[PDB]
Amino acid sequence: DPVYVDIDADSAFLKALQRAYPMFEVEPRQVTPNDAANARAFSHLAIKLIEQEIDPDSTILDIGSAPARRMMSDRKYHCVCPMRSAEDPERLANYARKLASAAGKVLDRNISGKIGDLQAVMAVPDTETPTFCLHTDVSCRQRADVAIYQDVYAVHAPTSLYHQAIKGVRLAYWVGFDTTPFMYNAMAGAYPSYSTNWADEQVLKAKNIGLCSTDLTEGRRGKLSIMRGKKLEPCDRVLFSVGSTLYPESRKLLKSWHLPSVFHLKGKLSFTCRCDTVVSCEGYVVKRITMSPGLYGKTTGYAVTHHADGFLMCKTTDTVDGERVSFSVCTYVPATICDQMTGILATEVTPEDAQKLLVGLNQRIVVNGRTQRNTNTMKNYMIPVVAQAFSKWAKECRKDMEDEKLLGVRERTCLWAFKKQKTHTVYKRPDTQSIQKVQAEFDSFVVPSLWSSGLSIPLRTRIKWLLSKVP
Amino acid sequence: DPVYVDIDADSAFLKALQRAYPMFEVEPRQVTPNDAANARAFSHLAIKLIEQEIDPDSTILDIGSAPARRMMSDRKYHCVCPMRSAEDPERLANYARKLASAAGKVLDRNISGKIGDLQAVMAVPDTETPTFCLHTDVSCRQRADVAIYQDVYAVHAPTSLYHQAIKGVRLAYWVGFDTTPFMYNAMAGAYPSYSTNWADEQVLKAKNIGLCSTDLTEGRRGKLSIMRGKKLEPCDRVLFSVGSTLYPESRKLLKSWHLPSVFHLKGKLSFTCRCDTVVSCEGYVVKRITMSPGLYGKTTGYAVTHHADGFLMCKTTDTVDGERVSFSVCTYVPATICDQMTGILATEVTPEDAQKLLVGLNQRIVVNGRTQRNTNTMKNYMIPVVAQAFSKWAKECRKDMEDEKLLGVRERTCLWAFKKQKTHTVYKRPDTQSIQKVQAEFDSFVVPSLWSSGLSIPLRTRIKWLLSKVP
Amino acid sequence: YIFSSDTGQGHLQQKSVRQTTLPVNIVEEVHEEKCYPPKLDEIKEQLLLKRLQESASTANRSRYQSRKVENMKAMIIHRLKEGCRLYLASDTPRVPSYRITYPAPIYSPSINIKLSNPETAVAVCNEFLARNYPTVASYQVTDEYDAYLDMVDGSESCLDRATFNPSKLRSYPKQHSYHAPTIRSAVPSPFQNTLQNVLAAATKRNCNVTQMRELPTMDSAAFNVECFKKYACNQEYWREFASSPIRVTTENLTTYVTKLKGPKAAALFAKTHNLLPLQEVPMDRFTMDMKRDVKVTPGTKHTEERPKVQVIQAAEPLATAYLCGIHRELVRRLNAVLLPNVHTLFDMSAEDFDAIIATHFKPGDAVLETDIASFDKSQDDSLALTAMMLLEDLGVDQPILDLIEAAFGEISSCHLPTGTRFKFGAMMKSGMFLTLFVNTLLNITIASRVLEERLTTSACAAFIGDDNIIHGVVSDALMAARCATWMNMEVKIIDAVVSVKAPYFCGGFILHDTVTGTACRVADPLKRLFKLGKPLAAGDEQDEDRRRALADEVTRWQRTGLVTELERAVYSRYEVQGITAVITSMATFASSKENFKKLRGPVVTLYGGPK
Ligand SMILES: Nc1nc2c(ncn2[C@@H]2O[C@H](COP(=O)(O)OP(=O)(O)OP(=O)(O)O)[C@@H](O)[C@H]2O)c(=O)[nH]1
Ligand SMILES: Nc1nc2c(ncn2[C@@H]2O[C@H](COP(=O)(O)OP(=O)(O)OP(=O)(O)O)[C@@H](O)[C@H]2O)c(=O)[nH]1
Ligand SMILES: Nc1ncnc2c1ncn2[C@@H]1O[C@H](COP(=O)(O)OP(=O)(O)OP(=O)(O)O)[C@@H](O)[C@H]1O
Ligand SMILES: Nc1ncnc2c1ncn2[C@@H]1O[C@H](COP(=O)(O)OP(=O)(O)OP(=O)(O)O)[C@@H](O)[C@H]1O
Ligand SMILES: [Zn+2]
Ligand SMILES: [Zn+2]
């Protein structure tokens, strides 16, 4: 009944996990000094919740399909394993090695069936087997009822969902990061609770962000180039760093998973879909999607996000390769810090003063003449940027009160030509929702109707030669 | 028989919930980290109270309900379930699956009768059934005594009630949000206790309200528009947000449910009706309506609302898409805060001074922290707007004292002056009442007929296969 | 301090309120003192400053400071009133009170006797010291190199829960200039501000843990308040006082600030720019202060062991200004509930004390004097609960009690020059603005519980600080058994008999006159005598307030009918003979400015000058 996770016994992340999963018992047991321990604990608990609310005697399709993780289980899994990354050769060999060693000792699970199953695929690479295949998500022919996506950012959501629906799938799940910052068109951001930093490729030579590197220069009054600039805008290329591992991604595919509340898929067959969020913890979310045959209802095309803690996005000036440039960054703030600065932000404060209070609030707070220690701390490398954002917010609010307009009318002065104001900070307080407009009607699907096997002869020989030596 | 609710054991909503229901004893039991626990907890208790006080062995109509949550109730229910919305395929499929999941476990709740009834309706879609129906509220032909509406905002109340009374209904109930804010012609508002925010369509791009979004900009000089503006008035489309779910609504249907004390329904037959409020708790009300045949009495056309907490509305200035405008915002205030601010509002107070006092009061009510850490009786994101309202109210009360007038006469200058004054804040203190003028004579009822099946062939085939087996 | 200090400032007032013109005691009513509200005026200052430049002999300057200080007082009121908006209240109807008055005292004539040559006076004093105190008169053989000798030997300390930087522990002496004394009493010089001295002062170990706020602690506190209300108070005011709370009021702040002096007001004004609210001021943070003077008593003990170092724990400056307006009301309420035969030195003067005990003490009467200084109040947590229970019964408003309670728990102290951190548990002695009041309440409670009903049937009882005197009580085994519940050295008791063993009270002697036949209180001559042998720091110009204080004290000593009694009282206490000559020597010293210059000498400079 208890669930064990591989994090420190004195960590401050235990309380966050317990509140997110109140139906389990969580105890720590550390056996590895991993640099991404927090990011793996959330995923481990998510699968147990997912596989508990679905009845047995049902087939589950796995898209990421790391076969080693699903070896010791009672549910029926169909792993879809293409060969398109440098991770794949290592995982396939590991799967074969574990299967051979596990033969005989374990009898409850279908170890014998899996071993014979893998040999059949090795004979000819074009057989759809109950537990394994070498096709993509589109080209798979096996029919099931439940589909599971785990940390998948390399597919188009509307296209992938449609191909699963026509095979008779009525339920889907998605576990991954929050896509809200990418809908605001930011440049760099961070997830301080999971030691994750991401930045655009164009600003990889910055000086004062989470993911950058620069050199030492004495200065130069004059230097030329080979092309004109005058514009710096985000492009379709970003880089992710989860503790110590690098992952390149694209903006177009990330934004495709920010599905609205209700949408219609129209093709040869029509379906009606819904999307809900069931679990949220400081950046990780779990989404459940249901699909039904037919086409009736109406759509509005809006997406709603609920904020349990503060969310900031401001404008900062930084030196990129010796040149001063300005761009936007975003981050998260704990709810306790936000609540304790309500009265301070009633006036105008300098960035220096705001920094001093933030450092003090991070250690102690006085209540009714009594001093107590704060148990909700935040990383110290994000304080300078947060303090700057708060100062800008306070000044903007004061200028709005000093200029009051009439009720029910607007001053467009003739030929209109109204004036626009300047905004330098967006601040979303706890218990506040954000609404955005997206597309809710899809009718275009394209498929590369060709099958190519990336499997190689030397890899086939090693796998066959590895499985031959049965214990 | 204690009642179990799905809320946290240390929440402050338990005290308010117990006070509104003195006949029951309630303790919490949390199994799911839902974002709308308070909203669902109130609805669960409301149904229990209605069932306790209703006459047994009677037939009840349910309008637009989910037939899965009435499965284990000994009362006689007839569910009117059309397929207008997009959430119906999931609800109907769940009902069929749950019925077949337990066919021998329960042998007294008429499970076999419900299954057999579902068989006939899926055969021919126009037949009647003592437990199921696919018509609308103005098309069902079965007769009974009681009708129940639970969170229904998509019908016109005078028209729907008249059609129910023809079949012989003498008692009805209604559960939902309070209608008072929409009778004041508000522009935006919030329910802080249930984490609900609503806003108009035209101000979805605001900056400092509950439900809005925007983006960073530098601001330019002059913007040429296309047609004339100079008008900002509420429209007929309103967006609701409960937790992380979105619901579109219309003002005309919302205002039709704020019925007066006595009204007459005249047509082929005549009835006399009354409306009373039974339970009220921080925004939810339960309404009881009795209907009798005949036509005799007298009507005045007034509606009365009793305030247990503070109700506030004021004028605020914000920027929509970079342009400054002004509109109105409404909210609720706890009674304890209102009582303790009586001594400060005797003079003129600065908005920043009022904000600091409100933060001090809210932070001090906790008077603990060894056990209850830091708990607040007011959400902190509404303090800025509330503080400004009190400042304007105090200013307006001063001017009346230096402008005393004679008793029984009116000051004019034909050729009179008759000058009006500014009003920027409406504040209803606890233990006060609000009165409105509405309509009380209804004699125009129309039926559109043209009933459609509203069911598809794949959906019927899929459902029939689900319960095609006896086990 | 209490009656009078060395400069004649004291803690008591100088206005008589307990005097009547009739030979019998008369009960009267307690009234209130109206205070002039300060007002702001800037045009007067501008014109007076310009008129100051054109002509200013002596009084023209004084008008400027009076105008300037008056402006500061008004500004402080305006700023202070805005901070405590959540605690401010109005004036409610007051509860009347009554008090007893006594006839005026009678004194005997005084005759002045003095010598002529001031050098002979020094010789007589030196002869007196050598004959009675041989070891003390031979200590001084060289200069004052105490600082160097303290540096040569290392540092010994007994600390608990403290942190410090070892790299800053260095104690090389600085420049020291003083005047060589003439009296051969070896009174040490004040210590230097070093890290070594700070650690030596904090060598106290009071680490004791008991039940914080559990059932056994509450039971002991409940019994203590029952004894206090049953054996030392009447029952005619409790129910009325509970109905009317005590809250912060504008009149309290206006009256308080107006009573401050010039320099004190200026110091408070400098800390009003960044004014924190009342609820933001911490109540459990203190600062450490060292500047004190060593305390020496007659005898031979400072020539063998080094004396201790005194320390002050200072609270927040804003904390002692927001709530210091409720002290007057607390004093009035406490005096109303006490029995007529029980007295407290608060709100009295020297003359009022004499009139009260004028006809109560006669020769052959037993007097019990007891002090409670030698008691560890930090061991038991019930001593703090008892004070709070008494405060709640007196009618203190509830939110204010929480602020007071926060200062009686865990506190921390810091030394700014060195960054040294200290932590202490439950502590009673501190620098807050309720220290004498709580100590007086605990002193009365302890005496009431131990003595039971013997306190009610008494002629006169006086309680102040840590000292008390009770008339007609002797020492028996019943009080020893009652007090031996935990240990035996809780309190120190001494038996005294009038005209045989003179009682001691607040550094003075209680004697019965012979010509008139009335009791009176006088000061201690030996304590003064050792004090004149204290070196004077260079650059000090306070050699005129001391002469007036000595002149007043000398006159009281030479009253007829008290010379013989004073001789016997000193001998029975210190076993010393020949003090009449010393008093005569003191008389000629306090006769002129030049006669006071014979107690000093040439200036000596040490550790200074690169030559
Ligand atoms: N941006 C991004 N993050 C991923 C991806 N795959 C996994 N992660 C995250 O990396 C974390 C750790 O990766 P693992 O689940 O241990 O898989 P792995 O192949 O062993 O990777 P490493 O442990 O880092 O060597 C996971 O918890 C994910 O949150 C991906 O494809 N893109
Ligand atoms: N404004 C509005 N509120 C609704 C409506 N329907 C339900 N609500 C409220 O929203 C709250 C959230 O409930 P949900 O999270 O949707 O779960 P549920 O109560 O089981 O009902 P469904 O999931 O919608 O089938 C409900 O408790 C209702 O009080 C609606 O149609 N309009
Ligand atoms: N169309 C697909 N259908 C199913 N699985 C896919 C598909 N495309 C990629 N994968 C799987 O995704 C996993 C890794 O994704 P990817 O091929 O993008 O590696 P990458 O080059 O490192 O880029 P990324 O940072 O997005 O992971 C592989 O296991 C791969 O089999
Ligand atoms: N005339 C009706 N009689 C009975 N039920 C109805 C009627 N009209 C709608 N409903 C029910 O209302 C529920 C949802 O409301 P609606 O049909 O208006 O679609 P929606 O837009 O998703 O909801 P809403 O308008 O409240 O935001 C459906 O379950 C539907 O059965
Ligand atoms: Zn496959
Ligand atoms: Zn029907």
Short mmCIF file of N, CA and C and ligand atoms in Angstrom, two decimals, chain A residues 274 298, chain B residues 62-66 80-88 91 135-138 151-155 246-250 253, ligand 4:
data_model
loop_
_atom_site.label_atom_id
_atom_site.label_comp_id
_atom_site.label_asym_id
_atom_site.label_seq_id
_atom_site.Cartn_x
_atom_site.Cartn_y
_atom_site.Cartn_z
N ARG A 274 -13.27 16.25 -25.57
CA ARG A 274 -13.19 17.15 -24.43
C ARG A 274 -11.85 16.98 -23.74
N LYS A 298 -21.61 22.54 -29.94
CA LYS A 298 -21.06 23.79 -30.45
C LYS A 298 -19.80 24.13 -29.67
N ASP B 62 -36.56 15.16 -13.43
CA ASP B 62 -35.23 15.76 -13.41
C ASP B 62 -34.96 16.35 -14.79
N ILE B 63 -34.64 17.64 -14.83
CA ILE B 63 -34.51 18.38 -16.08
C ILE B 63 -33.03 18.56 -16.38
N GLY B 64 -32.59 18.01 -17.51
CA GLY B 64 -31.21 18.17 -17.94
C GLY B 64 -30.19 17.61 -16.97
N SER B 65 -30.45 16.43 -16.43
CA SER B 65 -29.61 15.85 -15.40
C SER B 65 -28.76 14.71 -15.96
N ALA B 66 -27.78 14.29 -15.16
CA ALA B 66 -26.98 13.12 -15.47
C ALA B 66 -27.59 11.90 -14.80
N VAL B 80 -35.21 13.52 -17.92
CA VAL B 80 -35.37 14.11 -19.25
C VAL B 80 -33.96 14.46 -19.73
N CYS B 81 -33.45 13.68 -20.68
CA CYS B 81 -32.06 13.76 -21.11
C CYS B 81 -31.98 13.90 -22.63
N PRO B 82 -32.12 15.12 -23.15
CA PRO B 82 -31.84 15.35 -24.57
C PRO B 82 -30.35 15.32 -24.86
N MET B 83 -29.96 15.54 -26.11
CA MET B 83 -28.56 15.48 -26.49
C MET B 83 -28.08 16.81 -27.06
N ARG B 84 -28.44 17.91 -26.40
CA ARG B 84 -28.10 19.23 -26.93
C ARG B 84 -26.62 19.55 -26.73
N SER B 85 -26.06 19.22 -25.57
CA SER B 85 -24.70 19.60 -25.24
C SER B 85 -23.71 18.57 -25.76
N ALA B 86 -22.42 18.86 -25.58
CA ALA B 86 -21.34 17.98 -26.03
C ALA B 86 -20.85 17.04 -24.94
N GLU B 87 -21.38 17.15 -23.72
CA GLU B 87 -20.99 16.28 -22.62
C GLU B 87 -21.92 15.08 -22.45
N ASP B 88 -22.91 14.94 -23.32
CA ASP B 88 -23.91 13.87 -23.22
C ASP B 88 -23.38 12.50 -23.64
N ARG B 91 -21.70 10.96 -20.62
CA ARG B 91 -22.61 10.65 -19.52
C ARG B 91 -23.47 9.42 -19.84
N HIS B 135 -36.80 13.53 -24.88
CA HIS B 135 -37.46 14.75 -25.32
C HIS B 135 -36.91 15.94 -24.53
N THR B 136 -37.50 17.11 -24.75
CA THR B 136 -37.13 18.32 -24.03
C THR B 136 -38.08 18.52 -22.85
N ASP B 137 -37.94 19.66 -22.17
CA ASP B 137 -38.81 19.95 -21.03
C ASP B 137 -40.24 20.25 -21.47
N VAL B 138 -40.41 20.74 -22.70
CA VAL B 138 -41.73 21.07 -23.22
C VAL B 138 -42.25 19.99 -24.16
N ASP B 151 -28.73 23.40 -11.15
CA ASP B 151 -27.75 24.12 -11.96
C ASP B 151 -28.19 24.19 -13.42
N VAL B 152 -29.36 24.79 -13.63
CA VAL B 152 -29.94 24.95 -14.96
C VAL B 152 -30.06 26.44 -15.24
N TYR B 153 -29.46 26.89 -16.34
CA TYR B 153 -29.51 28.29 -16.75
C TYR B 153 -29.88 28.46 -18.22
N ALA B 154 -30.28 27.39 -18.90
CA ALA B 154 -30.49 27.42 -20.34
C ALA B 154 -31.97 27.43 -20.73
N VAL B 155 -32.87 27.70 -19.78
CA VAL B 155 -34.30 27.69 -20.06
C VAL B 155 -34.91 29.00 -19.59
N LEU B 246 -15.02 26.17 -18.04
CA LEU B 246 -15.59 27.34 -18.68
C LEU B 246 -17.05 27.08 -19.03
N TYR B 247 -17.89 28.10 -18.82
CA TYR B 247 -19.32 28.01 -19.14
C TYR B 247 -19.82 29.32 -19.73
N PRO B 248 -20.28 29.33 -20.98
CA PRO B 248 -20.89 30.55 -21.54
C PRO B 248 -22.35 30.68 -21.14
N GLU B 249 -22.75 31.93 -20.87
CA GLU B 249 -24.11 32.21 -20.42
C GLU B 249 -24.63 33.46 -21.12
N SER B 250 -25.94 33.65 -21.03
CA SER B 250 -26.61 34.83 -21.57
C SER B 250 -27.36 35.55 -20.46
N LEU B 253 -31.56 34.99 -20.05
CA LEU B 253 -32.00 33.79 -19.34
C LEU B 253 -31.64 33.85 -17.86
N1 LIG D 4 -34.85 22.64 -23.48
C1 LIG D 4 -34.08 21.79 -22.60
N2 LIG D 4 -34.69 20.94 -21.78
C2 LIG D 4 -34.01 20.16 -20.96
N3 LIG D 4 -32.68 20.19 -20.93
C3 LIG D 4 -32.00 21.03 -21.73
C4 LIG D 4 -32.68 21.85 -22.59
N4 LIG D 4 -31.77 22.58 -23.27
C5 LIG D 4 -30.57 22.21 -22.85
N5 LIG D 4 -30.69 21.28 -21.92
C6 LIG D 4 -29.61 20.64 -21.23
O1 LIG D 4 -28.49 21.73 -20.81
C7 LIG D 4 -27.41 21.08 -20.65
C8 LIG D 4 -26.18 21.92 -21.12
O2 LIG D 4 -26.63 23.19 -21.50
P1 LIG D 4 -26.70 23.55 -23.11
O3 LIG D 4 -27.58 22.53 -23.81
O4 LIG D 4 -27.28 24.93 -23.30
O5 LIG D 4 -25.19 23.49 -23.76
P2 LIG D 4 -23.86 24.17 -23.06
O6 LIG D 4 -23.45 25.38 -23.86
O7 LIG D 4 -22.73 23.17 -23.05
O8 LIG D 4 -24.21 24.62 -21.51
P3 LIG D 4 -24.45 26.18 -21.04
O9 LIG D 4 -25.29 26.90 -22.07
O10 LIG D 4 -25.15 26.21 -19.71
O11 LIG D 4 -23.11 26.87 -20.92
C9 LIG D 4 -27.55 19.80 -21.54
O12 LIG D 4 -27.30 18.69 -20.81
C10 LIG D 4 -28.99 19.81 -22.02
O13 LIG D 4 -29.58 18.42 -21.88
#
